[PDB]
Write an enzyme that holds these catalytic residues in place. Structure first.
Site, mmCIF file in Angstrom:
data_model
loop_
_atom_site.group_PDB
_atom_site.id
_atom_site.type_symbol
_atom_site.label_atom_id
_atom_site.label_comp_id
_atom_site.label_asym_id
_atom_site.label_seq_id
_atom_site.Cartn_x
_atom_site.Cartn_y
_atom_site.Cartn_z
ATOM 1 N N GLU A 1 0.802 -1.234 0.000
ATOM 2 C CA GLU A 1 0.000 0.000 0.000
ATOM 3 C C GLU A 1 0.834 1.284 0.000
ATOM 4 O OE1 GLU A 1 -1.141 -0.749 4.736
ATOM 5 O OE2 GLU A 1 -2.506 -1.305 3.115
ATOM 6 N N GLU B 1 6.514 6.759 9.937
ATOM 7 C CA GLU B 1 5.120 6.806 10.389
ATOM 8 C C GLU B 1 4.862 5.839 11.552
ATOM 9 O OE1 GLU B 1 1.755 6.567 7.473
ATOM 10 O OE2 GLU B 1 1.838 4.423 7.916
ATOM 11 N N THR C 1 21.611 19.959 -7.583
ATOM 12 C CA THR C 1 21.482 20.233 -9.017
ATOM 13 C C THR C 1 20.131 19.699 -9.507
ATOM 14 O OG1 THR C 1 22.271 18.958 -10.965
ATOM 15 C CG2 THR C 1 23.725 18.984 -9.021
ATOM 16 N N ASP D 1 22.975 11.038 -15.521
ATOM 17 C CA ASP D 1 24.158 11.858 -15.277
ATOM 18 C C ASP D 1 25.255 11.432 -16.255
ATOM 19 O OD1 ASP D 1 25.807 13.719 -14.049
ATOM 20 O OD2 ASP D 1 25.512 12.920 -12.027
ATOM 21 N N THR E 1 15.549 10.180 2.628
ATOM 22 C CA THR E 1 14.332 10.939 2.398
ATOM 23 C C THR E 1 13.484 10.926 3.663
ATOM 24 O OG1 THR E 1 14.319 10.367 0.042
ATOM 25 C CG2 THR E 1 12.232 11.126 0.998
ATOM 26 N N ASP F 1 5.528 14.493 7.833
ATOM 27 C CA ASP F 1 4.332 14.226 8.640
ATOM 28 C C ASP F 1 4.638 13.299 9.819
ATOM 29 O OD1 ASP F 1 4.631 11.970 6.887
ATOM 30 O OD2 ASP F 1 2.492 11.518 7.045
#
Length: 627
Positions: free
Chosen positions: A39, A50, A102, A207, A217, A221
């Protein structure tokens, strides 16, 4: 002591009972007890930031009801130890705040990737970096990476070791039409051990050459939820006269909040409303939208030659957290150590509340959000586009398969935070926003005569809000429609929770909305009567989408050829299951196959970690506010 406190304790015990299997051997919570699930994570014994933030929140409530704060302490201990990248995980150096990253464009379908780096496109200045280094004497970014392979199921291991548990991985990298079914799971720590010649890098970014590197990342939240949870742990510990033993952990939340400010900036620090990828980059806070965007991310070369940071240009109402923002801005215990930390969060609080109001539909539901980067390439908004501080309205920010705001869950999760903020401060705007949203919630939630219930599962949207000018217009052309209903227990609870904080706030500041309380209590009661089982609570759900296990082709470029750690070949034409062949050993694999071949939707009774937490917390919330 009370009935609803008792209910919390019962479910808390189910969650912590090792027989039920919510945690791994290191005490890391899985996404769910069940492994066959797809999911957001594509495997159940992966976990998310989370899940960790819910774990912290669960134990905060434990401490209120119990007086025992060790639970909350060990939750944070596990979080920092495993989910936040350590110094060796993110060995950053050679960072240039004047050239933070960049640029690469975002593209409509996965087959348009890898996205080429565009070196002429101006990128703005990062105004946070120098402040944070000065404050903390470190280049470590104190935020959770969003996705972990808890028991090394994929086989990348810790820092390319191929064996260790708690392995950092990522999936989503190829635009708004890359569903959970269309990704290539890959390690955050890239050493070219797996995948193709350049690891997995050249699936995502094109690249001239490729270097071994790390990148992470953040899910803003989740980090905000952890801060929100810690705020309540703080007030509750101070109430009991045990602030000091939890005071180390309130500082963790304050530091996390300090770095969470990266989520407040445009992806490439471009000015708000620029609408031109060739426009000059921002100089400082002219590229701040002051909202919790979809991510911030950071990466660096293995040898420390270079590093980068990005915010995000996409903002979803579902990510916002006025409770966390208010706490960081105004609560002196929660104050970030940096000079401008608290001040930025004060701005964010205000901007967030405006954002919610701007997005409020004619009916009362909150619409999706906004972007500062149209099509992810800083393109010109269409004629007649509604705007919010130069950002274009988007009904479904970031993802379209399915639409990110077709999930009713964001209504509950996000407005629950607004409700807490209102309960605490009595903010009139928050109250007015909630009043209309709660009115909507009452008109759509189903209480059936037989004792069952249903809440909205899927939503659809039409029209636009009016362009924002600091006042709610009513947004008469912005419309929500409830497409279908379900019995999602985690959301049902979060909804009840939101209703209880609103109702409690109205008792405190205005005219008591007893109806909101009664509806919430009904939801918690009807669910408790029906859905209890041996590991907690679950409601049957069919997953007709699980035919995508077998039918979803994963895009791989023609001639790109690689391997997964278990040996699965990665090439053009592979299916979801073809690069995840260990799924065939899953205890539930026979059940999935049976359903698929007979042309029917497979049914599950899931115990999602966050769902069970929301349930516990919602019941405990009744006790805290109305007990």
């Amino acid at each position: 002591l009370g009935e609803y406190g008792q209910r919390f304790m019962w479910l808390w015990n189910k969650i912590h009972d090792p027989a039920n299997g919510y945690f791994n051997q290191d005490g890391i919570p899985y996404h769910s007890v069940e492994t066959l699930i797809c999911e957001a994570p594509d495997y159940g014994h992966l976990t998310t930031s989370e899940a960790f933030s819910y774990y912290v929140w669960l134990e905060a409530v434990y401490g209120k009801l119990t007086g025992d704060w060790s639970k909350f302490k060990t939750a944070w201990d596990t979080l920092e130890k495993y989910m936040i990248p350590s110094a060796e995980d993110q060995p950053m150096r050679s960072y240039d705040p004047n050239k933070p990253a960049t640029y690469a464009g975002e593209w409509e379908t996965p087959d348009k990737y890898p996205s080429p780096l565009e070196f002429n496109v101006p990128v703005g200045k990062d105004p946070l970096h120098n402040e944070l280094v000065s404050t903390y004497g470190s280049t470590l970014m104190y935020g959770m990476h969003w996705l972990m392979d808890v028991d090394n199921w994929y086989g990348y291991g810790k820092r390319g070791d191929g064996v260790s548990r708690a392995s950092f991985i990522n999936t989503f990298q190829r635009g708004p039409e890359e569903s959970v079914w269309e990704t290539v799971p890959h390690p955050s720590w890239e050493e070219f051990k797996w995948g193709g010649p350049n690891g997995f890098l050249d699936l995502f970014i094109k690249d001239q050459n490729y270097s071994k590197q790390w990148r992470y990342t953040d899910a803003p939240d989740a980090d905000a939820r952890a801060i929100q949870a810690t705020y309540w742990a703080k007030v509750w510990a101070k109430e009991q006269g045990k602030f000091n033993e939890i005071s180390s952990y309130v500082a963790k939340a304050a530091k996390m909040g300090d770095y969470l400010r990266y989520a407040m900036f445009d992806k490439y620090f471009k000015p708000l409303g620029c609408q031109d990828k060739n426009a000059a980059g921002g100089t400082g806070y002219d590229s701040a939208h002051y909202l919790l965007s979809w991510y911030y991310a950071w990466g660096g070369a293995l040898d420390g030659a270079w590093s980068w940071k990005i915010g995000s240009s996409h903002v979803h109402f579902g990510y916002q957290n006025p409770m966390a923002a208010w706490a960081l801005a105004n609560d002196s215990d929660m104050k970030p150590k940096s000079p401008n930390g608290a001040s930025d969060w004060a701005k964010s609080l205000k901007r967030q509340i405006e954002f919610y109001r701007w997005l409020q539909s004619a009916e009362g539901a909150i619409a999706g959000g906004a972007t500062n980067s149209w099509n992810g390439r800083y393109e010109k908004y269409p004629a007649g586009t509604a705007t919010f501080y130069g950002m274009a309205y988007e009904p479904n920010p970031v993802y379209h398969d399915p639409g990110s705001n077709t999930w009713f869950g964001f209504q509950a999760w996000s407005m629950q935070r607004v409700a807490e903020y209102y309960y605490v401060t009595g903010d009139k705007d928050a109250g007015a926003l909630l009043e209309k949203w709660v009115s909507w919630v009452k008109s759509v939630v189903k209480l059936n005569s037989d004792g069952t219930f249903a809440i909205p599962s899927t939503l659809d949207w039409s029209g636009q809000p009016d362009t924002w000018n600091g006042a709610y217009t009513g947004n008469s052309n912005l419309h929500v429609k409830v497409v279908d209903y379900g019995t999602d227990l985690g959301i049902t609870a979060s909804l009840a929770n939101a209703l209880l904080y609103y109702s409690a706030g109205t008792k405190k500041y205005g005219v008591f909305d007893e109806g909101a309380k009664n509806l919430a209590k009904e939801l918690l009661d009807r669910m408790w009567k029906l859905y209890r089982d041996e590991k907690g609570l679950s409601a049957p759900e069919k997953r007709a989408d699980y035919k995508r296990f077998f039918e979803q082709e994963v895009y791989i470029p023609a001639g790109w050829i690689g391997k997964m750690p278990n040996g699965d070949v990665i090439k053009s034409g592979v299916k979801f299951i073809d690069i995840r062949s260990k799924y065939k050993q899953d205890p539930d694999w026979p059940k999935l196959e049976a359903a698929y071949k007979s042309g029917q939707a497979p049914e599950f009774r899931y115990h999602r970690f966050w769902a069970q937490c929301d349930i516990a917390i919602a019941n405990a919330t009744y006790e805290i506010l109305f007990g």
